Write a protein that binds this ligand. Structure first.
Ligand code: HEM
Ligand code: HEM
Lengths: 700, 697
């Protein structure tokens, strides 16, 4: 229907086709830094003092193509930071500022990130003067933070380490196929949090409060943070509004080329500064919108508000009787204005929940500072991962209970001879292979490569938020495996201290070695030590209530509330784990033949003899002498009807896909060859070593 | 609108968004074999003597879930190769057999490749026995070529080498959004069998076939070789009206394991399957070679009747031939039948002569069909240095872009410096050397690997006269100076011509780098030869003429899109990637490599000096842009005070507009990256100049 370079390919002929482009996004070819570049080794060598001494400079020179309000840019950079790490939705994990996606995406065109392309273009001198030693995400967010600092503040700190990706990330943002139309977080399509004029353009404070709380909750922010975040943020800078909001041009994706990749080039007046239009509201919040103080709340409790319209054609509030008419300084010189407020932010005065936590902030005006610093530092470094990546000399030392704190190694890391000793001690009185893998896999499947939260490290697999997960059948034998592993741990220690997660991954390794040896290959899985155990008080039970996978194909289990059919979720779960197209298929075959099945069902297994790591899943799948017909009980299962009329195999919806979707058919059509056995077991161990070492960030 | 794993973003909100996901396609991540796996090295060990002894067996055994007419699959295989090497489009170069795209693509769902999805399954007991030492594409077109030989025929040869791919390539097949360029009806690989556009008249079928095949290099005499030589084998499954067939494979319920067209009529297979909806049985012995097709084609006079499937097919009048055709599964014989496209060869005046001439002695038909089939198969492989295996018919050909054998003593870099010296110590300027070299290595298409810098065709008639290489400019001067150097060098180990072309290009890059302060050594691998004017035909090169070489900022007439896209579609052929594309475009813009001396695009104040000044001067926001008052697709870089300082084109400012490429320009446009930029430019350049060097890699 249209050319490929414009769109094209397939998907113009099929609406819902299993698109295999999401597995290998962000390839190593489109990386202009090269194939041997380590960002963690470079970003530590910048002189953050010199950088801090430079961003402070770019925040004072009013560039002539976009004038500076009050001769300072700080507000704009804080807004940039907030709209850069305000997309992080915990329901799946994708988004956030961990990829700096605000540059190129549907993000750099949402009808709220308007007048933000100019904000990024402002920072070009600093990135130009530094080069490859400053990834764009780090520059944006740290510029916001250093602005907040420069405008009079004492921040909690900051840490570099976010890496850039050079291709847009595909994330589901909303069913509404038009701007302003459960896995979501922005109540509109294109909004970040809330329609500034109240939900659905309706300026009601109560609905605004309900909605703003129901939105922030999908980003793990409490009730005290939300109030702190909003207040501390909007105590800075002004709005942008002039004539009718319909005069703005197109967005920086359908804009003409002479605009150098900008947008919203307003034709009204000179087009910038005193007449620039962006959100269609015209409000100044404080009375000195360029430096910090406890004044926004005073205005929040200083005048009684009544609704009005906007000179730009929008809804807002304004003090009655002309109170304070002409008391707030002009953004570019001129007579005073009237103290105004947005629609939502009045909720902080009427809503009874926020009232108890805002009325306290009139007196004790200092507590606002620390709470805002904490909430901000939480909003920033939310998608960086464990503590071991906070590079640079500005990170604090104290840990926070949301960081998933993992205590540092306080003993000698185990040795190699001890590794073989533990192998022998675990494969002689441990348990079957189908158990030592299932528990091990479950300890490394809570990972999410979106924000690198959770995983094998910490050993949380034996604590409350994960043992009770129904996906790891609690009334099964997982607790018995836990008892055995802890007792062999303490026995070897009584016989250099080995932690628990170390031993879990070692059990998985020894089980895979057992299966491979049963298959006829003396192969070894590479194991590196360097994990520690977490305690119940350092792992929040409620925070981890989202990692519980609603659909996990690699163990063949689907739950309830599943958005898409039970097949696509396999790739989705295989996309967070950052698995290439081959490493997903081989891993599926391995887990299927190894008996890593939820409740030990006879689904997925395609072998007459289990616990033997062979390619018997694939060779037996592609056989055409069997006919597949949906099950008679109609439970989303199928039946391997043979040529004799006897049911032979019984796979699930996540299996027969690996023999149907003509693309994924190819990868199987390799590992199922006659001489593929010396390759399968060798390509499998690689993928298994890759999964079990995703959260190993202290050494990689 | 929909989830990413099923549909995606970045497309619904804006349809006309420059999609860079077409550059990184076929990456190094989705490769099961992993990293290296030199396919050109593995297949050198397979026993074609044994592979033939196995495909011969898989054909004679009738599978129980798809019987074989007359107990032989030879037919269904012969077609499979054809529809696997019939997706060639000469006007672009994509498709072809060398992509193995017969599997995962819209290709395996077109309402023409029906029932063929079964054939890919009949071959599994063959590939399973070999695995990685024999890719699909080679196997598909071999089972094609190897079914002919096993059926009373001495073909011309065969060669492996078509390394497969692991993701569906992106190709434009047409504008219609419904089934039924090069194909005449969307989905139908070639001609709608029931006459062009459903009109059952042979005279129109002939004028359609002529133009259609003319889009795939086949002449007028190599056409009748195929059709007559291709439809001597096998029948056409079409019993029963084409109304009960299942859905297409890409959208079928999974209990079919990716097989499409689950026919509910009758038993569903065998003597009752449905493929295209025509019941026709050509020869009287449809599983061996003989001069039978032409015999029946002239044996009677024809008349149009209806089909048991509801299509228009023909049948001899007079009621003769009652039962003269063997029943495909034992029983009463049908009447002598025929398609609609075949009658063209009886009524069209052009094919009439050759058809009449093939009936006096059919050995000429055998030979012509042999050569035509060989051309139909080994077209998507290009240089003769890629053919592997024993069965290569290494004698010669004329359409293979032939080059003489590397005969003289090569060079051992002891004099390469002197050549790189005399090319500046007795030659021209950098703004001409890089221009002519890049021109001589721009006639390349990583699809079928035709053209290329090899052969030294930059001094021959088909390429010297192209418009994009302005002949009135100075190309002749550069070529004559290079010739004088070559002749002055061999009198004292002889060096060819394209040798000196790319060597002067590299030495000019070195000169420009010295003019910047980075004494960088360009790599160079000798071993290319110059072809003559006779072995370089003119008719097959008229397509390689670039219609929009965005690298050089040249826009011809005949672009379906603006210039901003015709750069990618160009930079997608050369097997480039976004970093290399940006770097190479910047280098060619700053080194003065436009098809004139135009200052259009140059963003420097001291040319002929390789540097990143283009990138850094592009991004400065203090410079505003607006369309020039000439309204000739040129923008006017207006400075802040009202003066003209830069003049760019659509191919330039796209790097300032499109957000993805903006990141790359940001990277190379720093200040501690000029060494990185010049080094990566040298690397990408040596990648371009060494695309067709297949005799070494
Ligand atoms: C949570 C609800 C929020 C709403 C409804 C909201 C809405 C808005 C609106 C309508 C504007 C004016 C846009 C324009 O002038 O074009 C704005 C700007 C701004 N926002 Fe937000 N925002 C929210 C959250 C935040 C947060 C979390 C922060 C900081 C942590 C923040 C900091 C700012 C600042 C400093 C500006 C001033 C921009 C300038 O001076 O140019 N806002 N916000
Ligand atoms: C204008 C060119 C062509 C037309 C109109 C045409 C038409 C057709 C049609 C409609 C079928 C029915 C498919 C089926 O029943 O499975 C068919 C089958 C077949 N075609 Fe073609 N085709 C063309 C080119 C070729 C070429 C170039 C070859 C060989 C080099 C070829 C060889 C065959 C064979 C052997 C079959 C029988 C397959 C079987 O019996 O399993 N055709 N042709």
């Amino acid at each position: 229907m249209k050319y490929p370079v414009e769109g094209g390919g397939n998907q113009d002929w099929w609406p819902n086709r299993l698109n295999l482009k999401v597995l290998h996004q962000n390839p190593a070819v489109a990386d202009p830094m090269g194939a041997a570049f380590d960002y963690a080794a470079e970003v530590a060598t910048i002189d953050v003092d010199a950088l801090t001494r430079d961003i402070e400079e770019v925040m004072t020179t009013s560039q002539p193509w976009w004038p500076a309000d009050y001769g300072h840019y700080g507000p704009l950079f804080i807004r940039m930071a907030w709209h850069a790490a305000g997309t992080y939705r915990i329901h799946d994990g994708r988004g956030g500022a961990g990829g700096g996606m605000q540059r190129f995406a549907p993000l750099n065109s949402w009808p709220d990130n308007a007048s933000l392309d100019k904000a990024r273009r402002l920072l070009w001198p600093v990135k130009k003067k530094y080069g490859k030693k400053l990834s764009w995400a780090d520059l944006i967010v740290f510029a916001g933070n250093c602005a907040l600092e420069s405008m009079g503040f004492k921040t909690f700190g900051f840490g570099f380490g976010r890496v850039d990706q050079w291709e847009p990330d595909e994330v589901y943002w909303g069913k509404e196929a038009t701007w302003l139309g459960n896995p979501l977080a922005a109540v509109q399509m294109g909004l970040i949090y809330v329609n500034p004029e109240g939900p659905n353009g309706n300026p009601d404070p109560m609905a605004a409060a309900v909605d703003i709380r129901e939105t922030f909750r999908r980003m793990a922010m409490n009730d005290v943070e939300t109030a702190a975040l909003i207040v501390g943020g909007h105590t800075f800078g002004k709005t942008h509004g002039a004539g009718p909001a319909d005069l703005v041009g197109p967005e920086p994706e359908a804009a003409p080329l002479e605009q150098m990749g900008l947008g919203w080039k307003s034709s009204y007046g000179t087009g910038t500064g005193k007449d620039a239009i962006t959100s269609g509201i015209e409000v100044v919040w404080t009375n000195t919108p360029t430096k910090w103080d406890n004044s926004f709340l005073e205005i929040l409790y200083g005048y009684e508000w009544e609704l009005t319209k906007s000179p730009a054609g929008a809804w807002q509030y304004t003090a009655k009787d002309g109170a304070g008419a002409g008391t707030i300084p002009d953004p570019f010189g001129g007579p005073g204005r009237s103290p105004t407020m947005l629609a939502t932010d009045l909720s902080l005065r009427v809503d009874p929940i926020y009232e108890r936590i805002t009325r306290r902030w009139l007196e004790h005006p200092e507590e606002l500072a620390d709470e805002f610093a904490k909430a901000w530092y939480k909003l920033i470094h939310r998608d960086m991962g464990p503590v071991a990546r906070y590079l640079g000399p500005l990170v604090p030392k104290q840990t926070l209970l949301w960081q998933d704190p993992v205590p540092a190694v306080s003993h000698d890391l185990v040795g190699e001879a001890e590794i073989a000793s533990l192998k022998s001690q675990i494969r002689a009185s441990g348990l079957t292979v189908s158990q030592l893998v299932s528990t091990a896999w479950a300890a490394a499947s809570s990972f999410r490569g979106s924000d690198k939260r959770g995983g094998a490290n910490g050993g949380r697999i034996r604590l409350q938020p994960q043992v009770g997960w129904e996906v790891n059948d609690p009334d099964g034998d997982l607790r018995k495996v836990i008892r055995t592993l802890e007792e062999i741990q303490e026995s070897f220690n009584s016989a250099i201290k080995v932690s628990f997660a170390d031993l879990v991954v070692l059990g998985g390794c020894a089980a895979i070695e057992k299966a491979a040896k049963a298959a006829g290959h003396n192969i070894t899985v590479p194991f590196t030590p360097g994990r520690t155990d977490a305690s119940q008080e350092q792992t929040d039970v409620e925070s981890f209530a989202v990692l519980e996978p609603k659909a996990d194909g690699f163990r063949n289990y689907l739950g309830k509330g599943n958005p898409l059919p039970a097949e696509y979720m396999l790739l989705d779960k295989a996309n967070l784990l950052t698995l290439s197209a081959p490493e997903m298929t081989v891993l599926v075959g391995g887990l299927r033949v190894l008996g890593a099945n939820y409740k030990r069902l006879p689904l997925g297994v395609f072998t007459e003899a289990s616990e033997s790591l062979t390619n018997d899943f694939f060779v037996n799948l592609l056989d055409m002498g069997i006919t597949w017909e949906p099950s008679p009980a109609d439970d989303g299962t199928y039946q391997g009807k043979d040529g004799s009329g006897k049911v032979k195999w019984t796979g699930s919806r996540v299996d027969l896909v690996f023999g149907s979707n003509s693309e994924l058919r190819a990868l199987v059509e390799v590992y199922g060859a006659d001489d593929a056995q010396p390759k399968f077991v060798q390509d499998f161990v690689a993928a298994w070593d890759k999964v079990m070492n995703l959260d190993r960030f202290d050494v990689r």
